[PDB]
Structures are given as structure tokens and as C-alpha cells.
Chain length 143, copies 2
């Protein structure tokens, strides 16, 4: 099945979108905003400048610099919690899985390979968000 | 860059392995067991559904109710696990299996067979890498 062979970045971007991004964007457009009601909403997705070993350390240092309050909204019979600043702050810790997939599935240039994968992860998010009409809701920012 | 083109199942299996399996197994090997008293006999039981459908989470919600678990904690390099007389069964549900359909549906512009083989590929890849790193005895994959 050559057609279902994807980069780990492409695969994890689609997984990250369906898990933590698309449910939040669908709820906001359905209710015209974030409901306990907030009219203006932004989902800020912070991307590290480089993809290095222990991505969790990078995000742990980044989360400390931001102050967030916990909020909750129900969707699909599920209470869902988000960290807000309205600014919904979400850290893609799933980026560590890019290096997890490559190192376990393969038998300088590696740092270049990770820089290309981080690009494809971000561009995949912009594409599916553009497809679903969520481009004004989702803002990707760097450190 | 053709070499880093994998099946979504293989990508997610290695992600699930590094996120949960490998740290829990490495902790067992270092402590000679599960330190909460150390339980010397520890096995991780991974429960997978028989079919990859939509709403795999509802499948796991159905599977959790049939199993009785107690929360335990340990520290590796704080982590929480659900366990089940000297022999401890660490129970884990790979809810990441929902990502296989998330990947194929989003990354592509009959379908039951593809998800069927992807579930097998997830299980095969997980066993393959666990066998490589020497954690095969601590891992057991079963279904409902």
C-alpha cells in the first residue's frame, strides 16, 4: 500500500489536528465563540525553533514562561479542558514522536532531517486548517 | 527523504512505544520490579480491539469497564499506571489507534481491509521493536 505511506510529521500533524485542534475549532464556530461566552477566540500553537532530543524539555521551559488558566467546555458528550491566557494556548508535545518514529523505524544530516520534518508538520496543519475554514482561528507562533 | 515514509500504524506504534512502553519497561529493569515495596513480577498487558472502526475511544470505553484497576505511581528520569499477590498486571489501552484513521482520512484526498491490516501492522511493529530492546518478556498484547 504505497498510497498510505506518510512522513511521521504528516501523520502526527493529522493526529494532532483531530485530537486537540479540530474539536476546539468546531465548537467555537458552532457557538460563535467559546462557551462556559467569548466572542473573539484564538488558538495559539507554539512551535519550537528547532527539533532536538528531549522535546519535552523544550516545551517544559516554554510552558513556564506562559501563565494559563484552566477552562472547560462540553463537546460530543465530552467535557474538554483547555489552557487559556481569549487565547487558547496549546503545546504540540507530539513533536517528540517525529524523532521516535524515525529512530525506531529506520535501520548533522539528522538535524537537517528534523528541520524538514518540523516544517512539514507546520505546513500540514496550515493546509488542513485552510481546508476546513479554520485559518483565522489557528495561529502558529515560534518561541 | 523516501526512507522516512512509513505506514501510520508503524509511526504510531513507535510513538506509543517511546511514550509509554519503553519508560515503563526501563523502570522495571532498573528497579528489578515495580517500586511504589517492589513487586518483582510485572507484565504490561496491552488490550487492543478486534476491529479498527470509527470511535475507537468508545470501544476502549467499553473495554475499560470490564477491567478492575488500581492507580500506582512511580518516577522515571512522575508517571501514573493502572495495575491489576507478587504478580502485577499493568493495564494500558492504546487509544492512539484512533490516529490511524485520522492520518489516512486527512492525508488522502475496501476501507475496512486497510484499517484491518493497519491494526495488525501496529501490533507487529510494537512487538518488533520491543523484542529488539529486550522488553519482550514484560509486554503482552491481547484483545477483548
Amino acid at each position: 500500500d504505497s498510497d498510505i505511506n506518510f512522513f511521521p510529521s504528516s501523520t502526527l500533524a493529522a493526529v494532532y489536528y483531530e485530537n486537540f485542534i479540530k474539536p476546539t475549532c468546531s465548537h467555537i464556530i458552532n457557538n460563535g465563540g467559546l462557551l462556559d461566552i467569548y466572542k473573539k477566540c484564538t488558538i495559539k500553537i507554539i512551535i519550537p525553533k528547532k527539533l532536538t532530543s528531549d522535546v519535552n524539555s523544550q516545551f517544559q521551559r516554554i510552558k513556564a514562561k506562559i501563565e494559563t488558566k484552566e477552562l472547560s467546555f462540553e463537546y460530543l458528550g465530552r467535557p474538554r479542558n483547555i489552557n487559556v491566557e481569549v487565547m487558547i494556548i496549546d503545546f504540540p508535545t507530539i513533536l517528540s514522536g517525529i524523532n521516535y518514529a524515525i529512530s525506531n523505524l529506520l535501520p548533522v544530516d539528522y538535524e537537517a532531517i528534523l528541520s524538514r520534518e518540523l516544517e512539514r508538520f507546520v505546513y500540514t496543519l496550515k493546509k488542513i486548517a485552510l481546508r476546513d475554514g479554520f485559518d483565522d482561528l489557528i495561529k502558529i507562533v515560534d518561541e
